[PDB]
Amino acid sequence: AQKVEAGGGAGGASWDDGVHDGVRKVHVGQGQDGVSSINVVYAKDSQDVEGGEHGKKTLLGFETFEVDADDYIVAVQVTYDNVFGQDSDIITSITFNTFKGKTSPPYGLETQKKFVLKDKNGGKLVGFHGRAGEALYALGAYFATTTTPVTPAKKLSAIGGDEGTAWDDGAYDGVKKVYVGQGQDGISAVKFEYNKGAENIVGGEHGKPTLLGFEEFEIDYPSEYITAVEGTYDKIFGSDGLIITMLRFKTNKQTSAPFGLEAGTAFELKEEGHKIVGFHGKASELLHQFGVHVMPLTN
């Protein structure tokens, strides 16, 4: 399942193998034209042993990264580059990000050509992959993943209330236009537009509209995406209930307006790889609880 590819050149031998009994420190010394020096140390049943310096070290290109016996590298930033004559592509910058909160500086020149790999599913780093020798041609690390069949859309869990009618739309073909209908108390009316099959659905008022009118935004569905949701809810009096008077959507390349006035406790709804296409929650008059679903809409 989770297995990142070794993006980079092929001019050495040091990729995924089983001979390495373990590891202790990693060095990446950026030479005059790319990662020209490395070092490989191991830790045995008593003490460490060194003698793994390879490539060509220089006073202007060397690094040191002490990997603790309790360190778990959960994320890494890896960059590569190619220039006219380099028939064996090489690495430019590396940046390890540990679970312990330690983040080493960019061990080289951050460039456009890069990839990113992190683990959120629960796996732990186990070793590395990537042909290397005189120059660091490529780098990468596999993750602990499981084997499962194809599954449907995942239901999530929000907060807001335990009383009112459920209006879970599940998922629709898309979102073509959106509107917000504020009330005197908070968001009491929400309506969206979409095209199902060949139809054009206009309307969607399933809440208490108010004389405050409506607000509207037409998001570019094929150009942009709602990567996550934000909002703040404040406590209403007389009951243990809640309401939402300020709801936002994370939007890239554009700026979605601040619908409402931020106050109360804050919340967010985010998942990796997946995008949003449907809601789940409850309302009878007022929008007590609002939640989302996640579906894999990546290439």
UniProtKB/Swiss-Prot annotation:
Keyword flag Repeat: yes
All copies of domain Jacalin-type lectin, residue ranges: 1-145, 153-296
Region called Disordered, residue ranges: 1-19
Keywords from the named record: Acetylation, Lectin, Repeat
Pfam families hit by this protein: Jacalin
Alphabetized Gene3D superfamilies for the sequence: Jacalin-like lectin domain
Modified residues (N-acetylalanine): 1
GO annotations of cellular component type: nucleus; plasmodesma
CDD domains documented for this protein: Jacalin (cd09612)
Classification via InterPro entries: Jacalin-like_lectin_dom, Jacalin-like_lectin_dom_plant, Jacalin-like_lectin_dom_sf
UniProt-listed GO biological process terms: response to zinc ion
Example of a GO MF term: carbohydrate binding
Family affiliation: Belongs to the jacalin lectin family.
Function: Sugar-binding protein showing significant affinity for (Glc alpha(1-4)Glc)(3) maltohexaose, (Glc alpha(1-6)Glc)(3) isomaltohexaose, Gal alpha(1-4)Gal beta(1-4)Glc, GalNAc alpha(1-3)(Fuc alpha(1-2)) and Gal beta(1-3)(Fuc alpha(1-4))GlcNAc beta(1-3)Gal beta(1-4)Glc.
Quaternary structure and interacting proteins, as annotated: Component of the PYK10 complex, at least composed of PYK10/BGLU23, BGLU21, BGLU22, JAL22, JAL23, PBP1/JAL30, PBP2/JAL31, JAL32, JAL33, JAL34, JAL35, GLL22 and GLL23.
Record's protein name: Jacalin-related lectin 33
Encoding gene (name): JAL33
